[PDB]
Amino acid sequence: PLTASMLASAPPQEQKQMLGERLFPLIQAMHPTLAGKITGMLLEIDNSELLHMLESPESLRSKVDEAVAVLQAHQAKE
């Protein structure tokens, strides 16, 4: 498992990579093609919050939905 202590022992860039690699397959189950963009969006969040999202599907889904809304708005402006 990825515990708070395990995460905390890693350098900052590695922490983001570790969180990303764990988040990606969970997000990919919900969004087979958009998972990479959504994961990249979520990775700017606090590491502690990202850890919680790994344990709570509801918390992850909520943030994933927010990310999709943001992406749709961004694509409209770009």
Binding site: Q13, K16, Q17, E21, L23, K37, T39, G40, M41, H74
Partner: peptide
């Protein structure tokens, strides 16, 4: 371009 896409096993583009 934004967002910095995550690709498994590739160092994340978003890292500065």
């Amino acid at each position: 371009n934004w967002p910095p896409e995550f690709h498994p096993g590739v160092p994340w583009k978003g890292l500065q």
